[PDB]
Write a protein that binds this DNA or RNA. Structure first.
Ligand code: NA
Ligand code: NA
Length: 242
DNA sequence: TTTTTTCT
DNA sequence: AGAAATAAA
């Protein structure tokens, strides 16, 4: 139940989430690669834009983020919109709903142009405000999956280029979608937002850091490289969620 | 069917 | 509100 899950997640902690994020998560790896091949402001803008079109894919997330990272390394990007107009139709892993996706990028372009290095620093220290402002630029609910995910991926990009760590805000919930609905149904009849927000508050681990832990473990990523105590806690979580 | 969104 | 937007079998 929620109490046992929260206890184990609390023992894993933000420290354990950060371990998975920085050592195992393939989207973090892809971002690290791209961060060496393009200026840091363009990098962050691209990561947000990419997140906002990361729905209803034609591949797995890890394939898609690596396609993005390898595509943009070394490129000279002016307009994010024009870059995606060329990139998406020729991609392998994001071929559906392209006109809709391109229009989202066009709509957020002005907001992205505000992301100087300093503004990125400010948002990394106040990710709740970034969350609301991305949603407002798009005219959408900040609770929506791709807006939440754009904050998550912003957080990865900012950690890399700013070489500092701020935890995700507790108030930003896990991205809601078919895979969290399916996992949660195995565990409980409670609705996912309420369930995971309760677990986050009880464990002290913000929902987006919980998100980092869940998917590699469910997907069979090896936990063997974790030190013995963390490894034990990750093994216990696998017993609950897989 | 399984793997989010706009326009309003 | 809820029909429609696209790729794969
Ligand atoms: Na479309
Ligand atoms: Na908002």
């Amino acid at each position: 139940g929620s109490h046992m899950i929260a206890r184990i997640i609390g023992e894993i902690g933000i420290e354990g989430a950060r371990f998975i994020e920085e050592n195992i998560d393939e989207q973090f790896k892809a971002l690290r690669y791209l961060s060496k091949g393009i200026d840091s402001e363009t990098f962050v803008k691209l990561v947000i834009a990419n997140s906002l079109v990361s729905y209803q894919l034609t591949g797995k997330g890890e394939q898609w983020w690596w396609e993005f990272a390898k595509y943009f390394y070394g490129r000279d990007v002016k307009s994010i919109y024009l870059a995606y107009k060329e990139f998406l139709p020729n991609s392998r892993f994001n071929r559906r709903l392209i006109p809709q996706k391109l229009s989202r990028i066009r709509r957020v372009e002005t907001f992205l142009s505000t992301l100087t290095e300093e503004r990125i620093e400010e948002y990394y220290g106040d990710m709740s405000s970034l969350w609301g402002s991305i949603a407002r630029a798009l005219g959408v609910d900040k609770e929506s999956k791709t807006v939440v995910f754009s904050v998550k991926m912003f957080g990865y990009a900012a950690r890399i280029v700013l070489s500092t760590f701020n935890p995700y805000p507790m108030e930003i919930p896990i991205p809601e979608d078919s895979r969290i609905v399916k996992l949660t149904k195995k565990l409980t009849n409670e609705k996912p937002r309420k369930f995971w927000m309760k677990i986050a508050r009880e464990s002290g681990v913000p929902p987006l850091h919980i998100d980092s832990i869940l998917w590699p473990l469910l997907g069979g990523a090896s936990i063997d490289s974790a030190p013995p105590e963390l490894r034990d806690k990750l093994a216990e979580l696998i017993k609950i969620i897989r």
